[PDB]
Ligand binder design. Structure first.
Ligand SMILES: Nc1ncnc2c1ncn2[C@@H]1O[C@H](COP(=O)(O)OP(=O)(O)O)[C@@H](O)[C@H]1O
Lengths: 190, 191, 190
């Protein structure tokens, strides 16, 4: 599990080192977690938890421990956002298939486009999903990115700037929050 | 002068003339005497709209007082060839050629305003020359009348004999009479 | 030469002609002898304004000396058909057909300047040829005369007898007298 879980999530490091680090960390965690005379065997649950923190995952995505949250995710969002319930059922179903291991192997969980009148709660349902799932909300106004020069800011920095710890604004923002909703507004203007 | 109009598009505002703005909505305008030049513009609009959506119906407003019959065939043939059904609306008045194009619309899409007029009369032409030449031209104009009466009967649904009697001399058909005669399906009041 | 007027927009300044700018304010102008081409232009403006706002009332000025009756009907039918209420403002000479458009204006919104002149007369036309042909054209003009007289009594409200008598011969009516005849609601206060 550790080798497979590390290859898919921890892509920055190479395979032998990443697998050994989660094995060494898992053992050390098992040493500090119990007060005295506790279970010696290391379950996958413990393995999943350590890999999650390394990848910055909130430990909920690794295994479907919080199945109750998915059961009432639609109802919770439906009450907060009155109307357009058809939209909410599609977002929840996408989250369930991915958390059940039926998601895309090399694609985002769900790519969605909200085509609707301005003022309707398109962003609202997005914000309530982030708050409900306990994940950062990344809001980008594409209206700002209407010129060729602005596009470069997404991937890269201004010429002559090292930008070692800042890099892109979109690329680095997902690194800090791997499990986070990415919202783009007025994409047509982009 | 043609007044300009502004439309809203995602990238930026779009400025179009009033006539071209209506073209985007499949609304063609047939005004004035028919001619080979104006008719060429009408067929050009029809062909352009077909590619955009060959399913959506075209709307051809008719406020023409009549014109050459040759140019009308280009519009009539074009209307039948294209898949989209052409909706003919008689604005103000429709003469012999205009009425021919009016009735040429798809069944169910032919309309006339309550105050519009519809005139129909045999083709008018003249040739001055030698007897031998006049013979050929006389036959041709008569053949042209035969081709118009047969096609009018097909669209209107009246017998060839009835059209010949009615078309022998000029006749003015009001908006309600056109529905009874069979030139249009009904008056344009509700939609 | 028609002058151009700059328009103020948040994105950027735009240039439009004086007539086109007025169209943005739902103002349509009418002048010169009524013609088929001129009428279709006014009709196009009416349809465009209807789609923009079918509730906002339209304003239609009239300074024409009269023209063909057939083309004028195209404007009348459109005004009745379109949901917006046209506010006919007689700014100058209004002949038989020009005056007809004023009556077609929605009740309660018809207006006429105090010094404007509105003259009404029977339709004028003629034909020459064989007697059989003259009969058809003669009957047609008489039928058209009835239709215009009948529709005149509809908007004005006067009896057919009264309309026939005033229209049998050339009649010139001032602005205050028009209110008595029901041709116009009332003169503009300011
Ligand atoms: N269905 C809804 N239920 C509750 N509030 C809503 C709903 N739709 C819109 N709103 C409110 O409207 C405002 C704008 O919503 P937002 O999603 O930002 O609009 P838009 O998608 O047009 O940018 C917010 O105050 C939001 O809470």
């Amino acid at each position: 599990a550790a080798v497979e879980l590390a290859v898919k999530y921890i892509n920055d490091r190479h395979l032998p080192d990443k697998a050994i680090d989660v094995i060494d960390e898992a053992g050390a965690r098992a040493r500090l977690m119990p007060v005295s005379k506790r279970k010696k065997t290391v379950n996958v649950a413990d393995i999943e938890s350590v890999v999650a923190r390394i990848a910055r995952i909130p430990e909920k995505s690794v295994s479907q421990s919080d199945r109750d949250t998915l059961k009432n995710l639609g109802d919770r969002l439906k009450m907060l956002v009155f109307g357009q319930d058809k939209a909410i059922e599609a977002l929840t179903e996408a989250i369930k298939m991915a958390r059940a291991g039926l998601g895309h192997e090399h694609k985002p969980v769900g790519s969605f486009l909200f085509a609707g009148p301005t003022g309707v709660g398109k962003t609202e349902v997005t914000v309530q999903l982030s708050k409900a799932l306990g994940i950062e909300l990344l809001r980008f106004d594409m209206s700002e990115y209407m010129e060729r020069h602005t596009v470069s800011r997404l991937i890269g920095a201004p010429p002559g700037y090292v930008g070692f710890d800042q890099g892109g604004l979109l690329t680095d923002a997902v690194i800090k929050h791997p499990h986070a909703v990415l919202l783009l507004d007025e994409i047509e203007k982009a | 002068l043609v007044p300009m109009v502004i439309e809203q598009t995602s990238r930026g505002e779009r400025s179009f003339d009033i006539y071209s703005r209506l073209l985007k909505e499949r609304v063609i305008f047939l005004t004035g005497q028919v001619e080979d030049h104006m008719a060429n513009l009408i067929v050009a609009q029809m062909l352009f709209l077909e590619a955009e959506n060959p399913e959506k119906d075209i709307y051809l407003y008719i406020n023409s007082p009549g014109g050459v019959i040759t140019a009308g065939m280009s519009i009539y043939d074009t209307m039948q060839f294209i898949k989209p059904d052409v909706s003919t609306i008689c604005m103000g008045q429709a003469a012999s050629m205009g009425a021919f194009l009016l009735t040429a619309g798809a069944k169910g899409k032919r309309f006339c305003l309550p105050n519009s007029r519809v005139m129909i009369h045999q083709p008018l032409g003249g040739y001055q020359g030698q007897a031998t030449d006049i013979e050929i031209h006389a036959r041709e104009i008569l053949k042209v009348k035969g081709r118009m009466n047969e096609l009018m009967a097909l669209h209107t649904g009246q017998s060839l004999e009835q059209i010949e009697r009615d078309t022998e001399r000029d006749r003015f058909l009001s908006a309600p009479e056109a529905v009874e005669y069979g030139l249009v399906d009904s008056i344009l009041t509700h939609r």
